Design a protein around this ligand. Structure first.
Ligand SMILES: CCCCCCCCCCCCCCCCCC(=O)OC[C@H](COP(=O)(O)OCCN)OC(=O)CCCCCCCCCCCCCCCCC
Ligand SMILES: CC(C)CCC[C@@H](C)[C@H]1CC[C@H]2[C@@H]3CC=C4C[C@@H](OC(=O)CCC(=O)O)CC[C@]4(C)[C@H]3CC[C@]12C
Ligand SMILES: CC(C)CCC[C@@H](C)[C@H]1CC[C@H]2[C@@H]3CC=C4C[C@@H](OC(=O)CCC(=O)O)CC[C@]4(C)[C@H]3CC[C@]12C
Ligand SMILES: CC(C)CCC[C@@H](C)[C@H]1CC[C@H]2[C@@H]3CC=C4C[C@@H](OC(=O)CCC(=O)O)CC[C@]4(C)[C@H]3CC[C@]12C
Ligand SMILES: CC(C)CCC[C@@H](C)[C@H]1CC[C@H]2[C@@H]3CC=C4C[C@@H](OC(=O)CCC(=O)O)CC[C@]4(C)[C@H]3CC[C@]12C
Ligand SMILES: CC(C)CCC[C@@H](C)[C@H]1CC[C@H]2[C@@H]3CC=C4C[C@@H](OC(=O)CCC(=O)O)CC[C@]4(C)[C@H]3CC[C@]12C
Ligand SMILES: CC(C)CCC[C@@H](C)[C@H]1CC[C@H]2[C@@H]3CC=C4C[C@@H](OC(=O)CCC(=O)O)CC[C@]4(C)[C@H]3CC[C@]12C
Ligand SMILES: CCCCCCCCOc1ccccc1C(=O)Nc1ccc(C(=O)OCC[N+](C)(CC)CC)cc1
Ligand SMILES: *[C@@H]1O[C@H](CO)[C@@H](O)[C@H](O)[C@H]1NC(C)=O
Ligand SMILES: *[C@@H]1O[C@H](CO)[C@@H](O)[C@H](O)[C@H]1NC(C)=O
Ligand SMILES: [Ca+2]
Ligand SMILES: [Ca+2]
Length: 1135
């Protein structure tokens, strides 16, 4: 119409979108200047100005809303409420108008104020790239519901188990004796807590409940030992972590299960439960880890990648001076370039030598060498423009880069006054990048990475917007509520706070890395309310398990002599090597000399070595060492066999040379380490492991270039970290550690001059610290030390240099990018192998696939006995009572069962317990009635043929068994121990399984998992073998590291120490999860107070190698497991 006409022109004018984006950005700026810790009710000039612009912004938003209203119409596809995002604009407009109106009525209620945060979310509409990305994301979300329902199953099952077992067990501490008589001066707490205000509680075990630690394990206090008086323990207090970790409700059990899904703080609560209830809850936690933290979030990744690929295809389917000549020959020689390459490489090596407490003369040689080098590059500069000319020089931009390098270098040389020596020193590292001009494959790899980054940019903006909105939300709801209680005269704010936008963004980034996020969860959820955990749940879920799976999908679909007896010999030797593994699993550093077991191990070693020598001799006489082709040593496995047997025999002869063992004990150590490597021939003696190792090594080469690039950035950032932090990683740990500036005052107060274990003194230490950072574990402490750094020999101060966030966060982002590139490279590499073999046999399967369709033609009607029950009193049962009409009632009763089992908690009222008993009775009645009606509906044939009514009968049988036993508790007919009653109550959870029949998508997804079990099973076997090797090796290396008060451990707390084989297998499992593994490796590399030679041994060289190798190998195996599942998923999708 005419009124629409005078306005519609501006609406589709792109300058309208431009000015809209300008006001959106101005609004984001105004939201970014919130200071909840200081902005108390807007009594400031800045607050007034910000409120004024907020009013102006609201005026403009209302104007644009109403104008697009009078230009599009209402309630129609073409109308204003046509886009999803226009409805959102409507919502912000109404919400802000309500907020303003309530401000008019003197009802502030800054809980409608927090709706501001959704205002930046309108910018998704005004960036068309963001519109497209978010549109595909939202259109692929609705197919994520299947894995969301699997998530619900694994949360509900484990939550019910937890609330049934450990409801209120977390609350019990060791209290004083009931009638405690004291002379006076009441100072004892009612119970025992080691650190002030329940920093680490002392959760006991009740009498009757066979826990582990039971109030007689209290460390005696060293006046009189007060801790011996804490005799009895009862279940009344607050429960740990400021009432945050418990199993009272089912909401709290969900919180704890979500904490162990993210693999953070897992072991601490595992030991909580072990102390409170029983030793055998590690089964619960291991199964929860394997099912949830590995087969849930990775199934989320698989489903999101596949669904995003499918959405990409779907929307795509809708569309479908004579020396100048002579001087050149030296230049383009392909050999002078190699000489200058050695020049640059030794320049890099020279830059790497520098370290802390560097000798006076060595650094002097370093500057001399730098001058020589830069003279060489300047000579190259002069030469290559003379024989070429200026324009020929400027043709290649690598020449521009080299010119910048040479000018920066020469400027740095002559700038020996100030400025140059401090920053142009940092620009020295750019000479390392010149190597890209020389490796041809690395040009191609970085070109591929730039091809990817063409599409990562829009995702980076979307992630930046997500982090901004969530940081502003955190500022609003967690502003100035994190203040730690006073310990030195004042309440210092927590480092992981929300007091300002910078700290909000860094803390949200930390949470997205899921490192120490549980600390922030506790500190914030105990401050506002227990419902505040929804903020972190929403943030972590949408970030890690939606947005990052989206990025992974973006990358993957942007890329896309005598006789021979050899019948049962291998199996007999396989049994023998298994027995060797069994006898390897006992060589703990605890059996005393001359033991009965020691003699057994020696004799077993002798016999096993003899048997393996016999095996080698038979193989070699069958083949010959290297006497011609197809000999013994022409396969890698056979070389490993010969190597192992030589190691064993040399170890035997050296052990028999024990007379005079001085200076050869190191040889003994090395040969014992190789004994621990020995249980490895299983790979050669098994087909599945051999093929899987071949597949691993085949899938490792293509990502070789990306691994090399990642190592190059590791070296570059290591040198940069050395430059930035030389001796700044020292701190004076003491009782005060306050009002002291430099270490001189530290020695005056005699506290200690402690040196952080993860520092940047050397370049090796820089590399170890950078690996710890890259593993996203313990990286927050390293970042804190970085920000605190001041200079060589004075105390670091809190947030001294907030500019190092750039270094420490850019490193994490770049390494994560390279790790995703490795993952996607592995996926596409496997995609080529699978696709080749797929087309042949699937076409061969399709020939037989249509035969099964012909088989269904036979299935038409084999005179089913539906009449046999007709007119036989089952006329209404077989047909009218077997359709979907009855299963909706049954699934409804199952849902009622679920919502009833979700009500038990600690100290539930007796009336609620009786109501639940009545509900359980009703559920038993309905299950029995359904089962009987089915049995009467059809004959006993399909009662077993269905493979499902069997499970239904099992559930009904357990339920009826349980209800009678609780009835036995009414008359007390026979005293039934509580164990069986509790077991059948907790087995009542099995009635959830009836939801599986209706969930066809769950069955399909879990099946698609199932036909991956060949590959997944062999990989799991190899993964367990990897644990076996590394566990034996860790027992031999680390078994003597004592863990006690004199040696304060950090990662090996109670059962994680490397003493025995199993107690080390547990800590290898924990390191595999990356939970405080950096703490474990800090524990291993530890100089002791001369109670052992190991602390003075070569541990510093070998423990980082041990842990780095283990973590990398474990992560690689898990990556390939996930890849195999993804491949079965895609292949199933194609058919
Ligand atoms: C070479 C350096 C590559 C940098 C990777 C270092 C790293 O960050 O490892 C930790 C990371 C665990 O990631 P997280 O967040 O804890 O789950 O683990 C990873 O994401 C890296 C896994 C990819 C494997 C790259 C190296 C493979 C070489 C070992 C092959 C062993 C074959 C047997
Ligand atoms: C992944 C889903 C489909 C199945 C999960 C199975 C667990 C919920 C069950 C199976 C083994 C059960 C555990 C078997 C052993 C014990 C020891 C028992 O300790 C004593 O009572 C003594 C406490 C129950 C518990 C932890 C059970 C807890 C519940 C567990 C972990
Ligand atoms: C889409 C949902 C699932 C995640 C998006 C996050 C927010 C929309 C939700 C999740 C967490 C919720 C918060 C959970 C805890 C709190 C603390 C709670 O604090 C108080 O009660 C203080 C007393 C008062 O203010 O009257 C107020 C509700 C609030 C802000 C909730 C506001 C709405 C939040 C931020
Ligand atoms: C791969 C290239 C580009 C990087 C440089 C090689 C470094 C990995 C190696 C070679 C020289 C080694 C350094 C040689 C000398 C020392 C001094 C030493 O400290 C002493 O004072 C003795 C500590 C080890 C360190 C820094 C070594 C750390 C590891 C370094 C830097
Ligand atoms: C001289 C005495 C008093 C101290 C011994 C020095 C060690 C503390 C330093 C010197 C060399 C350093 C090593 C230099 C090289 C590395 C490789 C590094 O491997 C990596 O993580 C980088 C490869 C990658 O992750 O991509 C592991 C740390 C390590 C073994 C360093 C461990 C610590 C070492 C042994
Ligand atoms: C089938 C193979 C491939 C894997 C199974 C081997 C291990 C899982 C088993 C076999 C040997 C067992 C170990 C045998 C010896 C020890 C030392 C043993 O220590 C004691 O007897 C002292 C305990 C005390 O003093 O109370 C504790 C069990 C433990 C760790 C066992 C842990 C579990 C082990 C390693
Ligand atoms: C594949 C990994 C991640 C899970 C395998 C779990 C179990 C096979 C491991 C982990 C915990 C270990 C237990 C940790 C504690 C002890 C007590 C200790 O002896 C007392 C040594 C045996 C045992 C049962 C260990 C046996 C081997 C266990 C059960
Ligand atoms: C220079 C351009 C930068 C472009 C941005 C790149 C985003 C960088 O990635 C982050 C950026 C900011 C904050 C956190 C992260 C991060 O890495 N999150 C996070 C992801 C996965 C997990 C996890 O366990 O799944 C395991 C998944 N793999 C593959 C195993 C299967 C191992 C990764 C935990 C945590
Ligand atoms: C530390 O220095 C401050 C500065 O005046 C002083 O007040 C205080 O007494 C000193 N000692 C301690 C333990 O704080
Ligand atoms: C160490 O700190 C004290 C305290 O201000 C200062 O007086 C002194 O100059 C500093 N440097 C030293 C002792 O080398
Ligand atoms: Ca972690
Ligand atoms: Ca951690």
């Amino acid at each position: 119409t005419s009124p629409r006409n005078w306005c519609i022109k501006m609406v589709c004018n792109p300058w309208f979108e431009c000015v809209s984006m300008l006001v959106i950005l101005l609004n984001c700026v105004t939201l970014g200047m919130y200071q909840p810790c200081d902005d108390m009710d807007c009594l400031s000039d800045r607050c007034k100005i910000l409120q004024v612009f907020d009013d102006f912004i609201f005026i403009f938003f209302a104007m644009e809303m109403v104008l697009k209203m009078v230009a599009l119409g209402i309630f129609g596809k073409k109308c204003y409420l046509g886009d999803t995002w226009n409805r959102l604009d409507f919502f912000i407009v109404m919400a802000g108008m309500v907020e303003y109106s309530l401000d008019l009525q003197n009802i502030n209620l800054s809980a409608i104020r927090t709706v501001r945060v959704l205002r930046p979310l309108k910018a998704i509409n005004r960036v068309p790239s963001m519109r497209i990305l978010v549109n595909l994301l939202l259109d692929t979300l609705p197919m994520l519901g299947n894995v969301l329902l699997l998530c619900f199953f694994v949360f509900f099952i484990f939550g019910i188990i937890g609330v049934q077992l450990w409801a209120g067990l977390l609350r019990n501490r060791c209290f004083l004796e009931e009638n405690f008589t004291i002379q006076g001066d009441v100072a004892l707490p009612p119970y025992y807590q080691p650190e002030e205000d329940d920093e680490m509680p002392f959760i006991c075990s009740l009498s009757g409940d066979n826990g582990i630690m039971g109030c007689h394990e209290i460390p005696p206090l060293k006046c009189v030992n007060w801790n011996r008086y804490y005799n009895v323990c009862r279940t009344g207090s607050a429960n740990p972590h400021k009432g945050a970790i418990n199993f009272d409700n089912i909401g709290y059990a969900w919180i704890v299960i979500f904490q162990v899904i993210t693999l953070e703080g897992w072991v601490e609560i595992m030991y909580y439960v072990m102390d409170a209830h029983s030793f055998y809850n590690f089964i619960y936690f291991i199964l929860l880890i394997i099912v949830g933290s590995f087969f849930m979030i990775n199934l989320c990744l698989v489903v999101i990648a596949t669904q995003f690929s499918e959405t990409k295809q779907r929307e795509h389917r809708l569309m479908l001076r004579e020396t100048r000549a002579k001087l050149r020959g030296i230049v383009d020689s392909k050999y002078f370039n190699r000489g200058i390459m050695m020049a640059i490489l030794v320049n890099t090596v020279s830059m790497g030598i520098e370290h802390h407490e560097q000798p006076e003369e060595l650094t002097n040689i370093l500057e001399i060498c730098n001058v020589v080098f830069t003279s060489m590059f300047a000579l190259e500069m002069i030469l290559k423009l003379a024989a070429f000319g200026l324009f020929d020089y400027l043709r290649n931009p690598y020449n521009i880069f080299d010119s910048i390098i040479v000018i920066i270098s020469i400027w740095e040389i002559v700038g020996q006054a100030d400025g140059g020596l401090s920053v142009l020193r940092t620009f020295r590292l750019l000479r390392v990048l010149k190597l890209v001009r020389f490796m041809p494959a690395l040009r191609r790899q970085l070109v591929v990475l730039m091809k990817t980054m063409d599409n990562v940019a829009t995702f980076c903006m979307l992630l930046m917007l997500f982090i901004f909105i969530f940081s502003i939300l955190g500022m609003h709801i967690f502003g100035c509520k994190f203040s730690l209680r006073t310990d030195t005269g004042d309440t210092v704010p927590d480092r992981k706070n929300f007091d300002s936008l910078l700290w909000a963004i860094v803390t949200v980034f930390q949470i997205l890395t899921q490192e120490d996020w549980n600390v922030v969860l506790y500190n914030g959820m105990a401050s506002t309310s227990p419902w505040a955990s929804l903020y972190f749940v929403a943030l972590m879920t949408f970030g890690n398990y939606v947005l990052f799976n989206l990025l992974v999908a973006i990358l993957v679909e942007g890329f896309q002599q005598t006789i021979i007896a050899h019948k049962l010999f291998d199996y007999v030797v396989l049994a023998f090597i298994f027995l060797n593994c069994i006898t390897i699993a006992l060589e703990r550093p605890q059996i005393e000399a001359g033991s009965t077991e020691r003699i057994f191990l020696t004799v077993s070693n002798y016999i096993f070595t003899a048997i393996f020598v016999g095996e080698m001799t038979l193989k070699v006489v069958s083949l010959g060492l290297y006497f011609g082709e197809q000999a013994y040593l022409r396969s890698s496995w056979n070389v490993l066999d010969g190597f192992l047997v030589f190691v064993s025999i040399i170890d035997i002869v050296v052990s028999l040379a024990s007379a005079g063992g001085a200076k050869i004990l190191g040889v003994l150590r090395v040969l014992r380490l190789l004994r621990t490597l020995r249980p490895l021939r299983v790979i050669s003696r098994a087909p599945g492991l051999k093929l899987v190792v071949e597949t691993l090594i085949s899938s490792l080469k293509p990502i070789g270039n990306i691994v090399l690039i990642c190592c190059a950035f590791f070296i570059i950032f290591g040198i940069l970290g050395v430059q930035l932090f030389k001796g700044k990683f020292y701190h004076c740990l003491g009782v005060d550690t306050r009002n002291i500036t430099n270490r001189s005052d530290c020695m005056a107060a005699n506290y200690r001059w402690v040196h952080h274990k993860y520092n940047f003194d050397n370049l090796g230490q820089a590399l170890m610290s950078l690996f710890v950072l890259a593993s996203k574990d313990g990286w927050v402490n390293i970042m804190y030390n970085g920000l605190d750094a001041v200079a060589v020999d004075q105390q670091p101060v809190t947030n001294h240099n907030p500019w190092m966030l750039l270094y420490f966060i850019s490193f994490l982002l770049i390494v994560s990018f390279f790790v995703l590139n490795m993952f996607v490279g592995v996926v596409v590499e496997n995609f080529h192998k699978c696709r080749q073999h797929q087309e042949a046999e699937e076409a061969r399967r399709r020939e037989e696939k249509r035969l099964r369709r012909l088989e269904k033609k036979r299935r038409k009607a084999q005179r089913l006995p539906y009449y046999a029950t007709y007119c036989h009193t089952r006329l209404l049962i077989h047909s009218m009572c077997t359709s979907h009409y009855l299963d909706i009632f049954i699934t409804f009763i199952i849902c009622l069962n679920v919502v009833t089992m979700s009500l038990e908690h600690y100290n539930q009222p007796t009336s609620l317990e009786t109501a639940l008993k009545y509900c359980n009775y009703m559920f038993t009645t309905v299950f029995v009635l359904e089962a009987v009606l089915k049995l009467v509906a059809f004959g006993l044939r399909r009662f077993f043929k269905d493979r499902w009514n069997q499970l239904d009968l099992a559930i009904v049988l357990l339920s009826v068994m349980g209800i009678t036993l609780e009835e036995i508790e009414i008359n007390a007919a026979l005293p039934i121990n509580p164990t069986i009653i509790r077991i059948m109550r907790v087995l009542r959870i099995a009635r959830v399984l009836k939801l599986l029949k209706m969930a066809t998508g769950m069955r399909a997804l879990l099946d698609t998992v199932v036909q991956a079990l060949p590959q997944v099973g062999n990989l799991g076997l190899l993964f367990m073998l990897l644990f076996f090797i590394y566990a034996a090796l860790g027992v031999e290396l680390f078994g003597k590291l004592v863990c006690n008060d004199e040696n304060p451990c950090e990662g090996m707390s109670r059962h994680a120490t490397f003493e025995n084989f199993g107690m080390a297998f547990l800590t290898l499992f924990q390191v595999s999860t990356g939970d405080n593994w950096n703490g474990i490796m800090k524990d291993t590399l530890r100089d002791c107070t001369h109670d052992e030679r190991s602390c003075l041994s070569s541990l510093q060289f070998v423990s980082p190698l041990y842990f780095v190798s283990f973590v990398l190998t474990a992560q690689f195996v898990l990556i390939n497991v996930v890849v195999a599942v993804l491949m079965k998923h895609l292949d199933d999708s194609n058919k």
